[PDB]
Design a binder for these strands. Structure first.
Lengths: 244, 120, 66, 52, 230
RNA sequence: GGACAUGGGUUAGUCGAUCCUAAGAGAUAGGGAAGCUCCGUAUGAAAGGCACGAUUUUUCGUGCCUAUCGAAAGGG
RNA sequence: GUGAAUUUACUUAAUCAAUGAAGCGGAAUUUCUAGCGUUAAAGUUUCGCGAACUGAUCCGCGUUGA
């Protein structure tokens, strides 16, 4: 009889904490220089992004049209160091950290911060230690088959760009937290998503799983995809269930 | 002759902005100066602390208008009593009226000036 | 007068002429604002028979309603 | 000094009599000078090699 | 030939010296009204224009245009100042008690006004009809070529509404009509009738029954041309 | 007697407010809504400047590039 | 909606992605280094940081990409 916690996550106190963020990690806007040649930038500083498991890299490029310096915020790949030169463009070399179109890189290249579509400045393989694999190319259709960190196969335009290398900060999930306090601090810079009360520990007015003399569901916890927002709890549209 | 654009932006052109030339003045008669010296200075203060400031600090204490500032009080005192102040301090009393301490110069005697005003 | 021809032509708004004019006008009216001042009536005889005179003091606005 | 407090100093007290004085350290300026000259020498050599 | 000058050339390749100031007129973020003008022009080119609307795309030739306008400038209507003067002169004539009805002569001038011209065509009094090519609500003139054809009135679609306006001392004229001329201009008129009918009315006709528009471009027709030749 | 009555009493270039921005509020452009009003904050806006010239057909040419409010514990 | 022989294609209507709506379509024809790159100049033709023309091709012009 009450709006449930899942429904209330539409904003307000559930917004992202964004004071200390060091900028939105994006590739260079796809320009003429990066479409037809390459542009060289300098890695100024590797910085910690609060709420992000991977470091960011401040890279300074030259504006090809004006006497000014454009500083771009990248997702740092492993091996990036301050003072390194990073080349972005079609004619860039195949070196770690360089941003090249996926169509110009051979099959099996390890890439990260890959663009879903040409010009959206990076969508895939952005988290720490994650990467995308170039499965193959289809030159006739101008497409590139890639392997995503979830194992899915995806087709992207051959002009979509990707940073060569693996996102830095890998192995970040291996270490156990050991602490509610450390989970508190990790999520304190991300959003209000912690701690989490179980639905079975609630009352019927608060949740489908609430109520009863014993903490149980009473119905199957695998729910359809057509169900209502107040009904989408538990395992939504589960094809398989249970531990294999 | 096709005009060359070197900005990729179109910015609104600057057009002549004529100044106002009304066919009639909206007010027939201009108002008189709403705050003149007779409205700026309301009354002097003759309380015992006011007398003490007069006889030692060479300072005259006046009940003044709320809208009067330090500059207008100095001009009002200069024009109403022909003595130029060297310093002015103001405070809003708890009864809502403004009170001004007017320190006169060594050239002027606050006792004498208080005598000419008549409240001494 | 031509207003008689305008009236009987407006009756035929499933003709190729009116269908083409409907397409181009609907496109350009969407590109303008929801309420925008019309310089002149697009149906001068329809406005004329509804009470519009072509002299100072008469105004035409175009508005699209969902 | 505090930022506004710098405005009361004369020019020489806020600067060092050297290129980029008051902006870069001595070693930073020296690295700028050497790196500029060496890379200009490099591009001259590459221009000589590629012009033929 | 002072040796101090030296060349100092600039290279504007990718990653080289800053690009020079170029014409960027084809990339400007134009105002909304300018985009409306140009995309409306593009839309009329792309779409399939019906025959009754596309017939206004076939206009009078330049040599025929200048000669017909030469005829029209001889029969411009009298200006407001001339009308006032004539009324003043005739009023003095009445005050002096002379023949006011015979002191003046029948006016010879071009006829204008959409309702007036349409009525003249229906009454068979019009000898020549000139239609503005770009009457913004096209329904105002779209029926005129068909009306003139039924009534046997020679008609032409001339360039631009403003030229017809300046003939009749206005900003705009949707259509002009010549109904009577002077004997010295009978031959020039008849030549204009013959040229207009031959090139525009006796010709086309099969064209005014055909569909206009449908022109693709500018790079898609190059795309199709490349695909066809390959 | 912090009660009752009568008077008196708070003086700033330097202490704060004012200035700045924070989370956040909130116009404008626009779009919704029968409407009260809602959303929106550089967005699908023509969103403003600065400099040179024997004065140029004594009818101006040639160049170059974001409100506001919100801290008497923050900044100053 | 427009075509070409259910089969293919096109884009101007609508949808999505990017930006400071910079180099789109045709034709003619910058990688050993954490440095600096602006406030054109040589060339040509008139008459000193006065000009012009190119330097810095032309054309189309649909801001690009899906």
């Amino acid at each position: 009889g009450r709006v449930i916690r899942a429904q209330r996550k539409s904003g307000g106190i559930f917004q992202a904490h964004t004071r200390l963020r060091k900028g939105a990690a994006q590739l260079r806007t796809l320009d003429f220089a990066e479409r037809h040649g390459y542009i060289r930038g300098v890695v100024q500083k590797i910085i910690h992004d609060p709420g992000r498991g991977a470091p960011l890299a401040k890279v300074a490029f030259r504006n090809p049209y004006h006497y000014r310096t454009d500083v771009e915020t990248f997702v740092a790949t492993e091996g990036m160091y301050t003072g390194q030169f990073v080349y972005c463009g079609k004619n860039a070399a195949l070196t770690v950290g360089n941003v090249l179109p996926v169509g110009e890189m051979p099959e099996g290249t390890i890439i990260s911060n890959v663009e879903e579509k040409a010009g959206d400045r990076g969508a895939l393989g952005r988290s720490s230690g994650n990467y995308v694999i170039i499965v193959g190319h289809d030159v006739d259709t101008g497409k590139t088959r890639v392997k995503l960190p979830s194992g899915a196969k995806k087709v992207v335009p051959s002009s979509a760009r990707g940073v060569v290398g693996i996102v830095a900060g890998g192995g970040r999930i291996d270490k156990p937290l050991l602490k509610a306090g450390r989970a508190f601090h990790k999520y304190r810079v991300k959003r209000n998503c912690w701690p989490r009360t179980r639905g079975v520990a609630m009352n019927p007015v608060d949740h489908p799983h609430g109520g009863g003399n014993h903490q149980h569901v009473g119905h199957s916890t695998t729910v359809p995809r057509q169900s209502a927002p107040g009904q989408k709890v538990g395992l939504i549209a589960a094809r398989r269930t249970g531990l294999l | 002759a096709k005009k060359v654009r070197t900005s990729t932006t179109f910015r609104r052109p600057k057009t002549l902005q004529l100044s106002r030339k009304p066919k009639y003045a909206r007010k027939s008669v201009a108002h008189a100066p709403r705050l003149d010296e007779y409205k700026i200075i309301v009354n002097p203060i003759n309380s015992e602390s006011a007398m003490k400031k007069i006889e030692d600090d060479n300072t005259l204490v006046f009940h003044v208008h709320l809208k009067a500032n330090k500059f207008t009080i100095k001009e009002a005192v200069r024009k109403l009593y022909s003595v130029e102040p060297v310093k002015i301090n103001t405070l809003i009393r708890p009864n809502g009226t403004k009170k001004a301490f007017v320190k006169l110069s060594a050239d002027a005697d606050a006792l004498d000036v208080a005598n000419r005003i008549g409240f001494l | 007068g031509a207003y008689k021809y305008l009236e009987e032509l407006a009756k035929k708004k499933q003709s190729d002429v009116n269908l083409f004019l409907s397409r181009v006008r609907a496109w350009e009216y969407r590109q303008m604002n929801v309420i925008h001042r019309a310089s002149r009536p697009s149906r001068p005889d329809k406005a004329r028979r509804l009470g519009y005179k072509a002299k100072q003091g008469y105004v035409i606005y175009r508005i699209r309603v969902r | 000094l505090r930022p506004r407090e710098f405005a009361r100093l004369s020019h020489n007290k806020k600067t060092v009599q050297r290129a980029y004085g008051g902006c870069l350290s001595a070693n930073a300026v020296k690295d700028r000078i050497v790196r500029a000259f060496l890379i200009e020498e490099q591009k001259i050599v590459k221009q000589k090699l590629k012009q033929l | 030939k002072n040796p101090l000058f030296v060349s100092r050339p600039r290279s504007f390749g990718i990653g080289q010296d800053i690009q020079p100031k170029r014409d960027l007129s084809r990339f400007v973020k134009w105002p909304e009204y300018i985009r409306l003008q140009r995309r409306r022009k593009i839309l009329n080119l792309r779409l399939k224009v019906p025959p009754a609307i596309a017939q206004f795309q076939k206009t009078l030739d330049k040599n025929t245009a200048t000669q017909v306008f030469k005829l029209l400038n001889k029969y411009r209507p009298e200006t407001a100042a001339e009308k006032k003067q004539r009324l003043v002169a005739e009023a003095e004539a009445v005050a002096n008690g002379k023949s006011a009805q015979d002191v003046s002569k029948k006016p010879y001038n071009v006829k204008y006004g959409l309702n007036h011209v349409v009525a003249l065509i229906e009454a068979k009094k019009a000898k020549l009809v000139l239609i503005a090519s770009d009457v913004d609500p096209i329904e105002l003139v779209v029926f005129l070529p068909a009306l003139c054809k039924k009534m046997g009135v020679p008609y032409a679609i001339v360039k631009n509404k403003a030229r017809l306006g300046t003939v009749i001392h206005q900003k705009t004229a949707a259509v002009l009509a010549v109904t009577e001329v002077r004997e010295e201009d009978k031959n020039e008129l008849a030549s204009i009738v013959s040229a207009v009918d031959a090139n525009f009315s006796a010709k086309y006709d099969e064209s005014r029954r055909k569909w206009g528009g449908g022109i693709m471009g500018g790079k898609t027709q190059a795309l199709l041309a490349k695909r066809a030749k390959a």
